[PDB]
Amino acid sequence: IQMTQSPSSLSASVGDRVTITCQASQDITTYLNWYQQKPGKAPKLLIYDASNLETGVPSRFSGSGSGTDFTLTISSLQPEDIATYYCQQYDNLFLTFGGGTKVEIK
Amino acid sequence: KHTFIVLYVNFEHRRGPGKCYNCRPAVINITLANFNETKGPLCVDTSHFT
Amino acid sequence: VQLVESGGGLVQPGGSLRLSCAASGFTFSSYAMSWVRQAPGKGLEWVSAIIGSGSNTYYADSVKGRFTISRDNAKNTLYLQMNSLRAEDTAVYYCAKDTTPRPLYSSGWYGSFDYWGQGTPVSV
Ligand SMILES: *[C@@H]1O[C@H](CO)[C@@H](O[C@@H]2O[C@H](CO)[C@@H](O[C@@H]3O[C@H](CO)[C@@H](O)[C@H](O)[C@@H]3O)[C@H](O)[C@H]2NC(C)=O)[C@H](O)[C@H]1NC(C)=O
Ligand SMILES: *[C@@H]1O[C@H](CO)[C@@H](O)[C@H](O)[C@H]1NC(C)=O
Structure with a gap:
């Protein structure tokens, strides 16, 4: 199993409604989760089961998808959101990470 | 002789328009390996089992 | 819930290392934990994983047969047995905790x- 994240990099300004997607290449149904990666730091969990907001994360994040496609949306970009993002599946014990993506300031 | 009494439990939420999570699960998998109701209960007959 | 690692360094290819990661602030035996590494300029690649009881171990294909994963529930510690390290293993390693608590049995x-x-x- 392999997953592709598109786009690899994009730039946006404060308040932009950034939308990002990653493809699973197989029927994953709902076993997907999103992560936060501020470079120079270890990752953190953002959304699990592709739709649940973790208790330690602000409500400005949302996600949806099923089957083979999956999407992550940011309601409004804030100055600390500039960091690497990652999607990873758990429909198989040999779990894999996505191709990676980076958001940039503008 | 060794007999393995393996119990498998699996359940999931009903796929549909509602992405509810705190609700009770709707579909239930419970199996007992070679258990088969028409044949009767699975009784261990070997000296050792787990 | 604090996680701290140790065992970093430089060794000639073909040697062995004893990586470690200590955990505290939660019931150690109730959560599965895994090792993952990020190569310089690349993303995250999974190394190995183990169940809370330590009865089952998992490895990726590129990692298969090369290293051994172990854990000690008495001391709340995680161990990764580095063996026959190739040049492509030069990266940074992270120990993570699974969110689902499971019974020891x-x-x-x-x-x-x-x-x-x-x-x-x-x-x-
Ligand atoms: C309810 O859950 C049980 C869990 O046991 C499911 O049974 C499992 O079904 C899959 C698909 O048929 C089996 O996978 C394949 O089975 C053959 C058997 O010879 C094996 O050669 C393949 O390598 C592969 O494992 C699986 O083994 C089987 N497990 C058992 C213990 O029977 C069942 O399908 C589930 N049903 C529903 C409706 O969710
Ligand atoms: C096992 O149970 C099925 C029903 O699920 C029954 O039709 C079948 O005959 C049983 N198997 C044997 C080998 O008797």
Whole structure:
């Protein structure tokens, strides 16, 4: 199993409604989760089961998808959101990470 | 002789328009390996089992 | 819930290392934990995983047959047995905790990691 994240990099300004997607290449149904990666730091969990907001994360994040496609949306970009993002599946014990993506300031 | 009494439990939420999570699960998998109701209960007959 | 690692350094290819990661602030035996490394300029690649009871171990294909994963529930510690390190293993390693608590008598699924440690890079 392999997953592709598109786009690899994009730039946006404060308040932009950034939308990002990653493809699973197989029927994953709902076993997907999103992560936060501020470079120079270890990752953190953002959304699990592709739709649940973790208790330690602000409500400005949302996600949806099923089957083979999956999407992550940011309601409004804030100055600390500039960091690497990652999607990873758990429909198989040999779990894999996505191709990676980076958001940039503008 | 060794007999393995393996119990498998699996359940999931009903796929549909509602992405509810705190609700009770709707579909239930419970199996007992070679258990088969028409044949009767699975009784261990070997000296050792787990 | 704090995670701290150790064992970073430089060794000639073909040697062995004893990586470690200590955990505290939660019931150690109730959560599966995994090792993952990030190569310089690349993303995250999974190394190995283990169940809370330590009865089952998992490895990726590129990692298969090369290293051994172990854990000690008495001391709340994680160990990774580095063996025959190739040049492509030069990266930074992270120990993570699975979010689902499972009974000690149960072998179950994992995947939704929530807490991570500081990290420990290695060179070969
Ligand atoms: C309810 O859950 C049980 C869990 O046991 C499911 O049974 C499992 O079904 C799959 C698909 O048929 C089996 O996988 C394949 O089975 C053959 C058997 O010879 C094996 O050669 C393949 O390598 C592969 O494992 C699986 O083994 C089987 N497990 C058992 C213990 O029977 C069942 O399908 C589930 N049903 C529903 C409706 O969710
Ligand atoms: C096992 O149970 C099925 C029903 O699920 C029954 O039709 C079948 O005959 C049983 N198997 C044997 C080998 O008797």
